[PDB]
Design a protein around this ligand. Structure first.
Ligand code: MG
Lengths: 156, 201, 251, 50, 1319
DNA sequence: AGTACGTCCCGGAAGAGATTCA
DNA sequence: TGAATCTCTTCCAGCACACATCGGGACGTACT
RNA sequence: GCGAUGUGUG
């Protein structure tokens, strides 16, 4: 239900968000809640409510990313071992209907429209794990099974 | 203002100044009459547009899931993040169309300026409420968290001006009851702490 | 004997009336409701009262409201005193009848005794040092305590129906005590931290906000005015908008 | 910890008047712990000045 | 179409969803429960019947004798509700019981000697229930809450985390019966299964296993499957199963048919599994060392000498292998262990076992149960037999058995009450599977495991406890049984039963004090649901989630109505449409769904039943055909909302209302409000207080009508008919001939309870709301109750309110009110205080009830009668005297007006101990009630005769009519009225025999009631005569009350003010109340604004109609106008016409309107801005709902036009002149010479520990020293102080705190010396 | 007849087992 | 052999109000 | 003229 594999750039970005929050946004909201609580001190005061709620959320996320920075394992490998599509690969797949579909595969904690937004613990990935330029990949979605053809493998 | 007044002219003038502050305040406050009316909370025209776009995005991610591109976990996570982004967009929209909408001639043609919509007034004043509360009046009221400390995959579409559909209100219910209940136990343990401290010093 | 000393410490306690373990000497000492926590680190006190509170913003914050009936009942000693000073009743008993009848002269004497005699106010959740302050009453109709608005936030006390209690120093030294260390004047800053504690709040600040904010164009636009006096003059006349860009002389 | 420094204080009547009675009073009673006042809670109890 | 009465004020309503199932009878829980508790039901099935069939028959010590139940009856009570409340005794009822008492045929097979069935011996009395669902213990009207407790059954909890720090989850299981002893299982990080009975200690569960007379071998066979080693020619091949491999990774040789299939250093593949299973190869050679990590299953012995080689539960070694080999064995049973599928849990447990037999097992059990005492074989035998295997001291109800098996995936919905071997076994299996990962723990708070009891269950259970009390002494005295010279009542004593039930209904965390200070209050508090009480969790021990609300309270428990403060969630209010299942769970309604149609078929559901379906939320736009207009729709499936497909749904909401409480449903525009203030408003609305003049809340909801009707405060006509006699005291109605009885029905009489006492000292009163000669429909109101109008719920009043800060006087929430209000009295509440004066004949003599009190003045002498009592109706101020009582010696003992209360006296009751001379006024009031009851029964029989002769006349309309020969003779000369051969002659013969019958009957009734009132009712010991006096202040209003709307907008009315100074409008009217706008956004409850706007609309419609009427314009205009009015709106269920109304009718409707066209609104299907706007545009008010105003002071125009409308506000009980209170110098407590606490006791405040802290914090010292020494403790110094004051010498002398002196003497009482010293 | 007067009664934390590396 | 690590079991859980009910039964008698 | 339990207020 989890895999600590990480890409270097994503790890960099994680450190980046970590610093951005615990160094810039937390102190801003800090000053904010302080001035808001300059003896306002009202439970009903939904300003204080929402502010502390932003606090709760940012704290949950910082603890999450903290435990991540702890456990997460980086593999920033070269394009050296190629052919196999084990991980970190720009890949295109096609359908009977010709559904072109391109993406690079990265770690769970990198799923955003930023660079490349396909998991590794995903079923698609599990199929894509070890195949070659011309294999017949198959999966079993909760809607049933399906298949695709490999069309591209690229590294960086 | 008051504070510097103190630190620079001592005490007696400070206090007399404070009471004069209060007098003149209440006076011109009443004389003004800052009410609040329903029409005084503008629904952002683009709100319907944005939340519809968000709906379409949800559908896109749902297609990705059903096509097996993602597991329910990151499904959940993607959805929540995108709703949050949408929420922030809506907040920006409403704050703009409130704080600036007042646009009037000058003996020239036009110009924008800080508003007089009483609710934004009551906020920017700093009397009570802020961007946060005026948000939960005009825009969506974001997301609510089940007792698990988790967070539900379908946010509050509407706001307080419009009517909440039942399930929504029902959710936000426990959302708030959590803390409203918390405060009791909290008070208790706090008092115990206080007592202990007093009898160490 | 074990029961006598500490019922409930050795095996099954022995019960009393029907099923509830009877109190013991140990009980009479320890616990939330033993002698220590019940009657010594705090206790009930004469010369006091309590009511509900309201606002009455016409009060130089070195004072506060107080209910007439309530006062007259409070200071009865002082009343008897000034009474037989002026010699309107030989015996104390006669003066008791006097007060009960509530005759005219009584009220004047009451005002007299109050004029400069600070009293103490308290709220229930007496958290911190502010939690008790003092004032000089001014006698008011009705039956509630009028209370300066600013001091609310110090009391952490909205007007949702909160009850406040009043005490009255009986002795002279204590009158000095109040007037020296308990008269809100002498507390603009929480000993906790440096912030002021006389911060205005919602209404008054809404007021000032509306009171100082330019529009772009309104009655009396950009005229010129020597005296802020005459400014207020314009405003009361209505011959010129309240908030309006303007050049004025000031000092 | 406070919940201790309370107990082992020079005085006792304070402790006696804090968080529990029996432990403290007994240990005193065997200690013959003659006790001055030199303390708020103390004088408050005896009600003289502070 | 509508009822005639309804038409009087046809409340318009918004709303879209066609309501399909009306609101049920809101007292369902109470009435159903109690009715079920008491009825002669056959076949047992949960009643007194059930309790009996459980307890009886009681048998002797086989002493040829026995006693058994037969039947039982309940005689009509000895009083009625009303007079009962007046007097004080409970509203109990007799309990007759028929018992067959038999003695077996001694010295013979089982037979009989003689039997006796006692003539329904009565075993004391228990209460009935009010038709309105209350109880009456002691001159009061109390209620029983219903409890919500962990349902008996079996459960599986985590206790994740916080134990052992191991970062390892745990798993425990629990069985709790309905009446017995808890039984739990759990684990320790060493993975060891422990049982505990009733939380005493811990034991190795296998202990109780072996306790169930099992053999180690069987136990192992049960908890584990087999692994077979066959000792072949050699090499001892193992039997294998492929599925036994996927949870494995074997790194050694794995071969078959010669071929290796998993090499040494590999893992298992599902492909390996499939190949093998297709091959079906089980007998395979194995490495000899593989056995090393295995454990024997059965026992094996030396076949030659029968001698033991190895016992079960024993690991394996090569030496063991050789020894068993040479012995000659060939089959080896071992345990299929694992680290993911199956763990050695039971085995290692059995290892940890100290004992190895049934005997010492029972020994250890008895040792944990009764410590210290020596063991005894048969003793412990019987003990363990008396913990899970007997009717007496252990039982689940059917409820238990059901939920139990349902958890265990069993089949039979029914079963025994006792446990089984199989039961405990399967429980353990479930727990083990859970440990293994398959299966799921069950969160406690999921309502599917909470259960609702009710008064019924409570009474049943406690009455059972009473019977088990009695049976003990029953069998005791049966032991000494002699030959028939006795009767069962000799061998039975009601007194314990009575005592038990008495204590229950008197003192409980449930038998509490009804808040009859508002019809709405009653109807709420009769539905309150608590997790407190016996068997229920407790505040201090209360956890966290239990308080929180679970996603399945939905539509079964209000999410929002609950008091804040020292406890929340624990008092969950009960949902509106909710009901109680046969088995006793929160059952809720839903709408059945076909393929694609929302059929009107209602259908109830449990909690768990819901989870397996999918449910469509209420506000879902359907189209006339049961078809949703969408294809994806918001729904909920399992504690999770989502969007699902069209044809997936199963059931739909019933009505939007169905997810709040009455205590909430009455919150207009709830939807536009946060939960926090929503709650607080609901509560405060509960704390409402009636007024002098009910006034039909403008902006209502729709639930009101129902609330009023159910809450029996008002009076609904049983039958329907026509008004005959109205009177502010009573109302009497003729019935239509159809609904008449099959004969001789007559008419109906409704006595109206007039001004009298609440339970919160708040006037309760009734007022007729009909007129002479008027139709009434069955099931309709006749007289409004307190805070009710025209059969609708009216808590506060409507008022013209405006939002603008005004000279600060609304600083925080300081609601400012205008003298206009206090003019119209339109908050003038009415209170009543029940003051008691009694005497007791004691040493130094009895006492007096006379005016013979010396040392008084004519002031007191006057208002009292000559007989010693205040006259009815004296305006008495404080210090006055109501009754004259004296201490013979003979000082005063008078009962006097408690200080500070003004008011007047309405009535005086006087009870007296039978056997004392009734004084002059006693006789006077005696005769007063006498004559009044006589006149009452005279009304009864006289107008009964009136209806009787009118019915005879109605019979003589046809058939044998003799008009003149009928009216010449007086209306009684009718013994042989000449009639035809129809049944009308037989009818008149019926009425004539009834004439004579009723003559004698009324006679006996009169005389009986005479004796009733004449007797001197039993009372306390030594008491002489009760004289209760009622007073009635008219507390008006004054700065310091607590008003609020219905959205938490609390307020303390701050400064009343004169008409001038209020803001007003160009049209001219003043306004009435000013709230604070700066309170709106923060407490994010925008609703009150909407309410206000829609009101402004309402009163606009009003003023418009009022003008139209004052013009005396003819009807046509009114028709057009009101028709337009109701017609506006997008779509409504409220499509009313006007045409079918009569001219006279409509006019009356308008006249009821003129105060304002009342709009209601369903809780979520309610109206919207656009329709509000259009209603306004119908009126003549500005669209925005903001107007120019004018400060009377300034007499000029405010800027930024503001909001004025009508808000519906309420007053609370927290009246100032109750709260406000002071003390200078009064009483002093007796133990500690300290002041007293409270107001009633004329005591002072409490300077608290934290305040001591405070004053300490200030350098202020003399303050605190004075305020601990003088003001409280020293009597000596206190007096010195008071004197020195009277001489102005502001001074003090401390002395010593007498309380501390007391501490000293107390500790000194303890075995401790403590002293002061020198200086 | 029936009784008013008789006796008759969840977290912490620290201690004593008690268990395990020697 | 003895110093660590479980494990029963005593002690405390805010402040101030307001109001409400209820407070022994049982067993046995010298009379009332 | 005490204490228990409950309810409600902040
Ligand atoms: Mg408050």
């Amino acid at each position: 239900m989890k895999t600590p594999l990480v890409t270097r750039e994503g790890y960099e970005k994680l450190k980046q968000e970590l610093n951005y929050l615990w160094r810039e946004e937390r102190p801003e909201v800090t000053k904010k809640v302080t001035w808001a609580a300059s003896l306002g001190d009202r439970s009903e005061n939904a300003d204080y409510q929402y502010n502390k709620k932003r606090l709760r959320e940012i704290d949950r996320r910082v603890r999450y990313l903290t435990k991540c920075m702890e456990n997460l394992k980086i593999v920033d490998y070269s394009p050296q071992q190629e052919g196999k599509v084990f991980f970190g690969a720009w890949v295109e797949i096609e359908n009977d209907d010709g559904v072109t579909h391109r993406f690079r595969i990265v770690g769970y904690d990198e799923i955003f429209g930023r660079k490349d937004y396909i998991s590794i613990d995903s079923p698609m990935a599990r199929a894509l794990l070890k195949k070659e330029v011309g294999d017949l990949a198959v999966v079993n979605t909760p809607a049933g099974e399906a298949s695709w053809y490999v069309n591209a493998i690229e590294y960086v | 203002m008051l504070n510097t007044c103190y630190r620079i002219l001592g005490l007696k003038p400070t206090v007399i100044f404070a009471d004069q502050i209060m007098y003149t305040g209440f006076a011109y406050a009443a004389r003004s009459g800052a009410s609040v009316g329903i029409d005084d909370m503008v629904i952002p025209e683009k709100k319907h547009e944005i939340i519809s776009e968000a709906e379409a995005e949800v559908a896109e991610i749902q297609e990705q899931f059903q096509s097996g591109l993602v597991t329910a976990g990151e499904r959940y996570n993607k959805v929540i993040d995108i709703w949050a982004a949408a929420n922030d967009r809506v907040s920006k929209a409403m704050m703009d169309n409130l704080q600036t909408e007042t646009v009037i001639n000058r003996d020239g043609q036009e110009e924008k300026q800080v508003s007089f919509n009483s609710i934004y007034m009551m906020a920017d004043s700093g009397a009570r409420g802020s961007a946060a509360q005026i948000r939960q009046l005009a825009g969506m009221r974001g997301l609510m968290a089940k007792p698990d400390g988790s967070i539900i995959e379908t946010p509050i579409t509407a706001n307080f001006r419009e009517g909440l559909n039942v399930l929504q209100y029902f959710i936000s219910t426990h959302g708030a009851r959590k803390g409203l209940a918390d405060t009791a136990l909290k008070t208790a343990n706090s008092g115990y702490l206080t007592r202990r401290l007093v009898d160490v010093a | 004997v074990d029961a006598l000393l500490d019922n409930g410490r050795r095996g099954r306690a022995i019960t009393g009336s029907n099923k509830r373990p009877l109190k013991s000497l140990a009980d009479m000492i320890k616990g939330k409701q033993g002698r220590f926590r019940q009657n010594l680190l705090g206790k009930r006190v004469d010369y006091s009262g309590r009511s509900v509170i309201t606002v009455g913003p016409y009060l130089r914050l070195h004072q506060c409201g107080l209910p007439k009936k309530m006062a007259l009942e409070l200071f009865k000693p002082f009343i008897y005193g000034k009474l037989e000073l002026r010699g309107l009743a030989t015996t104390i008993k006669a003066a008791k009848k006097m007060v009960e009848r509530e005759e005219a002269v009584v009220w004047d004497i009451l005002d007299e005794v109050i004029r400069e005699h600070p009293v103490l106010l308290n709220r229930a959740p007496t958290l911190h040092r502010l939690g008790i302050q003092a004032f000089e009453p001014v006698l008011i109709e009705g039956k509630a305590i009028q209370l300066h608005p600013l001091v609310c936030a110090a009391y952490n006390a909205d007007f949702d129906g909160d009850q406040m209690a009043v005490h009255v120093p009986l002795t002279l030294e204590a009158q000095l005590e109040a007037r020296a260390l308990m008269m809100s004047t002498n507390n603009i800053l929480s000993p906790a931290n440096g912030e002021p504690i006389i911060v205005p709040s919602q209404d008054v600040v809404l007021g000032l906000y509306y009171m100082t904010r330019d529009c772009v164009n309104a009655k009396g636009e950009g005229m010129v005015l020597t005296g802020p006096k005459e400014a207020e003059r314009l405003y009361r006349s209505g011959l010129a908008s309240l908030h309006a860009r303007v050049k004025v002389r000031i000092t | 910890g406070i919940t201790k420094a309370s107990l082992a204080t020079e005085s006792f009547i304070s402790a006696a008047s804090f968080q529990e009675t029996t432990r403290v009073l007994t240990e005193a009673a065997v200690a013959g712990k003659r006790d001055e006042l030199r303390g708020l809670k103390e004088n408050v109890i005896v009600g003289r000045l502070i | 179409v509508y009822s005639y009465t309804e038409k009087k004020r046809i409340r318009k309503d918004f709303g879209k969803r066609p309501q399909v199932l009306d609101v049920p009878y809101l007292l369902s829980i109470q009435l159903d429960s109690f009715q079920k508790f008491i009825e002669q039901d056959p076949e047992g099935q949960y009643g007194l019947e059930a309790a009996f069939r459980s307890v009886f028959p009681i048998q002797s010590y086989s002493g040829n004798s026995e006693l058994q139940y037969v039947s039982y009856r309940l005689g009509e009570p000895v009083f009625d509700v009303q007079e009962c409340q007046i007097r004080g005794v409970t509203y109990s009822a007799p309990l007759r019981v028929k018992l067959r008492l038999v003695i077996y045929e001694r010295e013979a097979p089982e037979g009989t000697v003689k039997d006796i069935k006692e003539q329904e011996v009565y075993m004391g009395e228990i209460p009935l229930m009010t038709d309105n669902g209350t109880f009456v213990i002691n001159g009061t009207e109390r209620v029983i809450v219903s409890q919500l407790h962990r349902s008996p059954g079996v459960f599986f909890d985590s206790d994740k985390g916080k134990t052992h720090s191991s970062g390892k989850v745990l798993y425990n299981a629990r069985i709790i019966p309905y009446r017995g002893s808890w039984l739990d299982f759990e684990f320790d990080p060493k993975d060891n299964l422990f049982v505990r009975i009733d939380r005493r200690r811990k034991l190795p569960a296998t202990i109780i296993l072996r306790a169930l007379n099992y053999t180690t071998e069987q136990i192992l066979d049960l908890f584990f499957e087999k692994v077979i080693f066959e000792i072949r020619d050699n090499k001892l091949q193992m039997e294998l199963v492929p599925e036994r491999l996927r949870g494995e990774t074997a790194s050694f040789d794995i071969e078959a048919n010669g071929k290796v299939y998993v090499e040494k250093g590999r893992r298992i593949t599902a492909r390996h599994i499939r190949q093998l299973e297709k091959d079906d190869v089980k007998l395979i050679e194995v490495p000899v060392e593989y056995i090393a990590g295995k454990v024997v299953a059965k026992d094996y012995i030396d076949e030659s000498t029968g001698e033991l080689i190895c016992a079960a539960n024993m690991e394996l070694s090569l030496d063991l292998l050789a020894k068993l080999s040479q012995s000659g064995h060939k089959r080896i049973e071992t345990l299929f262990t694992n680290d993911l599928d199956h763990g050695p849990y039971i085995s290692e447990t059995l290892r940890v076992d100290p004992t190895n037999d049934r005997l010492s097992a029972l020994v250890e059990i008895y040792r944990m149960m009764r410590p210290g005492e020596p063991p005894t074989r048969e003793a412990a035998e019987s003990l363990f037999e008396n913990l899970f295997f007997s009717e007496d001291r252990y039982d689940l109800s059917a409820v238990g058995r059901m939920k139990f098996n349902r958890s265990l995936l069993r089949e039979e919905i029914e079963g025994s009450g006792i446990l089984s071997k199989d039961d405990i076994i399967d429980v353990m299996k479930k727990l083990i599977d859970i440990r293994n990962g398959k299966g799921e723990v069950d969160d406690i708070d999921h309502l599917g495991n909470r259960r609702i009891r009710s008064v019924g269950e409570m009474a049943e259970n406690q009455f059972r406890v009473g019977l088990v009390r009695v049976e003990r002494a029953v069998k005791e005295r049966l032991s000494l049984g002699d030959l028939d010279t006795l009767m069962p009542q000799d061998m039975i004593n009601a007194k314990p039963i009575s005592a038990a039930v008495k204590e229950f209904f008197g003192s409980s965390q449930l038998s509490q004090f009804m808040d009859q200070n508002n019809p709405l209050s009653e109807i709420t508090h009769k539905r309150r649901i608590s997790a407190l009480g016996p068997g229920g969790l407790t505040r201090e021990r209360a956890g966290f989630e239990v308080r929180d609300v679970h996603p399945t309270h939905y539509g079964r428990v209000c999410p929002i109505e609950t008091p804040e403060g020292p406890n929340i969630g624990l008092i969950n209010s009960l949902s509106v449409y909710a009901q109680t299942n046969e088995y006793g769970f929160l059952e809720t309604p839903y709408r059945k769904v076909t393929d694609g149609v929302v059929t009107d078929e209602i259908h109830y559901l449990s909690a768990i039943e819901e989870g397996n379906y999918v449910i469509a939320q209420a506000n879902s736009n359907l189209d006339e055909e049961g078809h949703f207009v969408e294809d994806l729709v918001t729904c909920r499936s399992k504690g999770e909302s989502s969007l699902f497909s069209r044809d997936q749904v199963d059931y739909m909401d019933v009505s939007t209302q169905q997810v709040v409480s009455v205590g909430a449903s009455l919150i207009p525009f709830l939807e536009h409000d946060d939960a926090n203030r929503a709650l607080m408003g609901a509560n405060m609305q509960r704390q409402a207080v009636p007024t002098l003049r009910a006034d039909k809340p403008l902006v209502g909801t729709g639930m009101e009508r129902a609330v009023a009707v159910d809450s029996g405060v008002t009076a609904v006509a049983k039958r329907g008919g026509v008004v005959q006699y109205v009177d502010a005291s009573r109302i009497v109605i003729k019935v239509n001939e159809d609904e008449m009885y099959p004969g001789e029905a007559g008419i109906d009489i409704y006595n109206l309870t007039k001004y009298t006492r609440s339970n919160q000292n708040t006037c309760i009163n009734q007022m007729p709301c009909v007129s002479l000669g008027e139709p009434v429909e069955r099931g309709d109101v006749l007289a409004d109750g307190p805070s009710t109008d025209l059969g609708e719920l009216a808590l506060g009043q409507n008022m013209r309110v405006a939002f603008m800060p005004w000279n600060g006087y609304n600083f925080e929430d300081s609601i400012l009110v205008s003298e206009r209000v206090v003019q119209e009295d339109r908050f003038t509440t009415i209170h009543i205080q029940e003051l008691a004066c009694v005497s007791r004949d004691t040493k130094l003599g009895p006492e007096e009830i006379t005016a013979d009190i010396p040392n008084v003045g004519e002031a007191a002498l006057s208002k009292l009668d000559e007989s010693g009592i205040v006259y009815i109706g004296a305006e008495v101020t404080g210090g006055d005297i109501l009754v004259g009582k004296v201490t013979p010696k003979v000082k005063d003992s008078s009962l006097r007006v408690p200080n500070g209360v003004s008011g007047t006296v309405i009535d005086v009751q006087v009870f007296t101990r039978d056997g004392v001379e009734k004084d002059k006024r006693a006789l006077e009031i005696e005769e007063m009630q006498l004559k009044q009851a006589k006149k009452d029964l005279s009304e009864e029989l006289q107008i009964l005769e009136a209806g009787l002769f009118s019915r005879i006349r109605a019979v003589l309309v046809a058939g044998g009519v003799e008009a003149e020969k009928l009216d010449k003779l007086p209306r009684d000369r009718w013994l042989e009225l000449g009639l035809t051969d129809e049944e009308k002659q037989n009818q008149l013969e019926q009425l004539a025999e009834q004439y004579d019958e009723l003559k004698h009957e009324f006679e006996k009734k009169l005389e009986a009631k005479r004796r009733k009132i004449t007797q001197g009712d039993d009372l306390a010991p030594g008491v002489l005569k009760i004289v209760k006096v009622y007073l009635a202040v008219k507390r008006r209003i004054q700065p310091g009350d607590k008003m609020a709307g219905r959205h938490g907008n609390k307020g303390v009315i701050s400064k009343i003010n004169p008409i001038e100074d209020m803001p007003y409008d160009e049209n001219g009217t003043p306004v009435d109340i000013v709230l604070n706008p700066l309170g709106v956004p923060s407490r994010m409850n925008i609703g009150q604004i909407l309410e206000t706007h829609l009101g402004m609309a309402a009163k606009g419609i009003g003023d418009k109609i009022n003008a139209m009427l004052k013009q005396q314009q003819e009807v046509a205009k009114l028709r057009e106008f009101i028709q337009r009015a109701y017609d506006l709106g997008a779509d409504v269920r409220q499509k009313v016409d006007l045409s079918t109304f009569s001219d006279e009718e409509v006019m009356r409707l308008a006249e009821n309107l003129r105060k304002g066209m009342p709009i209601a609104t369903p809780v979520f299907d309610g109206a919207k801005e656009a329709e509000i706007k259009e209603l306004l545009k119908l009126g003549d008010l500005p669209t925005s709902g903001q107007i120019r105003l004018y400060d009377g002071r300034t007499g000029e125009q405010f800027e930024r036009p503001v909001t004025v409308g009508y808000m519906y506000m309420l007053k609370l009980n927290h009246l100032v002149d109750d709260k406000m209170h002071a003390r200078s110098t009064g009483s002093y407590s007796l133990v500690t010479q300290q002041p007293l606490g409270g107001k009633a006791q004329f005591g002072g405040q409490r300077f608290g520990e934290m305040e001591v802290w405070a004053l300490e914090a200030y350098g202020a010292a003399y303050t605190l020293q004075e305020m601990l020494t003088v003001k409280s403790d020293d009597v000596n110094g206190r007096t010195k102080m008071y004197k020195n004051i009277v001489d102005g010498n502001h001074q003090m002398e401390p002395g010593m705190p007498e309380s501390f002196n007391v501490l000293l003497k107390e500790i000194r009482s303890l075995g401790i010396n403590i002293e002061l010293e020198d200086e």
